[PDB]
Amino acid sequence: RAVFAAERPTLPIPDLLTTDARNRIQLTIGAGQSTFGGKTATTWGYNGNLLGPAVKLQRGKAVTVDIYNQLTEETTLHWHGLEVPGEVDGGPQGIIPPGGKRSVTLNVDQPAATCWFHPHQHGKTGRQVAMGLAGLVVIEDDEILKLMLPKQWGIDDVPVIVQDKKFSADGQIDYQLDVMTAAVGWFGDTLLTNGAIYPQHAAPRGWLRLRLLNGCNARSLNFATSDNRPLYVIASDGGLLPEPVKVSELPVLMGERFEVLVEVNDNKPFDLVTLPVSQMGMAIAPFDKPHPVMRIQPIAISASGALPDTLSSLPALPSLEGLTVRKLQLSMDPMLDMMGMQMLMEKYGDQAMAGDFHHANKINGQAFDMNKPMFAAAKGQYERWVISGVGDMMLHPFHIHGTQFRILSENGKPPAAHRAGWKDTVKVEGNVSEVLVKFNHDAPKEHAYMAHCHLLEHEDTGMMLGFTVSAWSHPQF
Numbered sequence: 431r432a433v434f435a436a437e438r439p440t441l442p443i444p445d446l447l448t449t450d451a452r453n454r455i456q457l458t459i460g461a462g463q464s465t466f467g468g469k470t471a472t473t474w475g476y477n478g479n480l481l482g483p484a485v486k487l488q489r490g491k492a493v494t495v496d497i498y499n500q501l502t503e504e505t506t507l508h509w510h511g512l513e514v515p516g517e518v519d520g521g522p523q524g525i526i527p528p529g530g531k532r533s534v535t536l537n538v539d540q541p542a543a544t545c546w547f548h549p550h551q552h553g554k555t556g557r558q559v560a561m562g563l564a565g566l567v568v569i570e571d572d573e574i575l576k577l578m579l580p581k582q583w584g585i586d587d588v589p590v591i592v593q594d595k596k597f598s599a600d601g602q603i604d605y606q607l608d609v610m611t612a613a614v615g616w617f618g619d620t621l622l623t624n625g626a627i628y629p630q631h632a633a634p635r636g637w638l639r640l641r642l643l644n645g646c647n648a649r650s651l652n653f654a655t656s657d658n659r660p661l662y663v664i665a666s667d668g669g670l671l672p673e674p675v676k677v678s679e680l681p682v683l684m685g686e687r688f689e690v691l692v693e694v695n696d697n698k699p700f701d702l703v704t705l706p707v708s709q710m711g712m713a714i715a716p717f718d719k720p721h722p723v724m725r726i727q728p729i730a731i732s733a734s735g736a737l738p739d740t741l742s743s744l745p746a747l748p749s750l751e752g753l754t755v756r757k758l759q760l761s762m763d764p765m766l767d768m769m770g771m772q773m774l775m776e777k778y779g780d781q782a783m784a785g786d787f788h789h790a791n792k793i794n795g796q797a798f799d800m801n802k803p804m805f806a807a808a809k810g811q812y813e814r815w816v817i818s819g820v821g822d823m824m825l826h827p828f829h830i831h832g833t834q835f836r837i838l839s840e841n842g843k844p845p846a847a848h849r850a851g852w853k854d855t856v857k858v859e860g861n862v863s864e865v866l867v868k869f870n871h872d873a874p875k876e877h878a879y880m881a882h883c884h885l886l887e888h889e890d891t892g893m894m895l896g897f898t899v900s901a902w903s904h905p906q907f
């Protein structure tokens with residue numbers, strides 16, 4: 431406790447940004463500065479110094495987003511979790527030059543969900559996210575609004591973007607893509623919640639809705655409350671579960687979102703915390719013990735948001751016979767594993783095991799080739815993708831663009847109930863995962879979809895593939 435200041439900063443709330451009268455939204459990508467622990471640091475942000483707004487979209491309504499790159503280097507803008515055509519997907523092919531402008535029209539056609547957006551610059555995604563770039567996407571539809579969930583933005587409906595950073599002694603963000611981070615990821619000893627260190631949020635009595643995003647480059651998290659009151663999971667990456675799922679702890683992989691309701695009953699403050707995980711590098715101090723994320727400070731007013739018995743209906747799993755099967759093998763060059771582990775041991779000592787690297791991470795023996803999509807999927811068809819991490823012991827949250835899928839097997843076991851709805855990420859760690867995926871939109875070679883590990887340093891050093899989606903593919907044509 432003595433390590434944190436007695437008074438907590440107020441939890442910053444990203445602005446909720448909707449369409450203007452011309453059905454447009456403006457996003458600037460820029461460099462500014464932020465203060466962490468009383469030290470100012472250069473940071474990057476969308477419409478601001480750090481992080482970004484929550485872009486709010488209505489299902490079935492078109493928006494054009496005008497994107498202005500005001501950095502001195504190239505970037506891209508990817509809408510993580512959005513079912514949109516490859517042309518507006520903002521993967522590594524969607525380059526926006528410094529001083530450049532690109533406009534994309536999003537025709538939102540998926541269930542209400544909390545998605546997010548971030549850079550996807552080839553080989554530099556880890557650095558650009560670490561510098562500060564990430565924003566949220568709130569998709570709404572008539573269905574979710576009829577539920578009368580907690581819905582006062584920044585009061586009882588609260589975005590919670592949780593990220594670690596490593597800072598140097600001069601206060602600046604200390605990012606590196608090197609042999610150690612290419613192996614185990616970039617991680618640090620300071621946890622940010624909407625950009626603030628251990629902030630406090632003033633919560634009315636009643637249900638409090640938290641839209642949780644693990645926005646770390648490489649660190650997996652496991653949310654719980656300080657007094658072990660339950661979290662009611664109401665939504666995953668791609669939207670509402672069929673019914674709330676009660677959990678006492680909530681593991682969240684890099685890039686995943688969950689929305690939870692937690693009870694604010696009496697006046698006693700309590701914390702959202704993250705519990706120690708079993709992931710290389712990640713249980714090193716200060717994360718060897720439960721670590722505070724946010725203080726919830728009850729206030730006098732009440733709020734009347736509901737915890738509904740029923741939230742939504744999801745389609746039953748279809749027959750799996752006859753469906754196209756795609757096999758993806760994740761791998762790391764053994765030299766990278768050896769050297770990266772050596773560096774981790776040098777940097778942290780014995781506690782690290784207490785419980786050309788630029789193309790050394792691979793899928794099906796291939797480090798990402800932006801000019802060679804690995805295959806073509808058929809639009810509108812359910813496919814079974816089988817992703818294996820047998821062979822190494824690293825954690826790979828495997829993410830597929832252009833879709834919200836259904837997990838069939840997560841790392842060799844059936845998915846937990848709260849992970850059996852709409853997901854865009856599945857854990858792969860020394861075992862095999864299978865997902866049921868359908869692509870509703872096209873993506874040509876020039877604007878292909880990505881499928882990749884979302885441990886950003888793995889992605890940046892090769893663990894990504896491109897794929898196209900069209901109505902059909904036949905070699906004669």
Ligand SMILES: [Cu+2]
Nearest residue numbers: 509510511831
């Ligand atoms: Cu994505």
Ligand SMILES: [Cu+2]
Nearest residue numbers: 826883885888
């Ligand atoms: Cu990985």
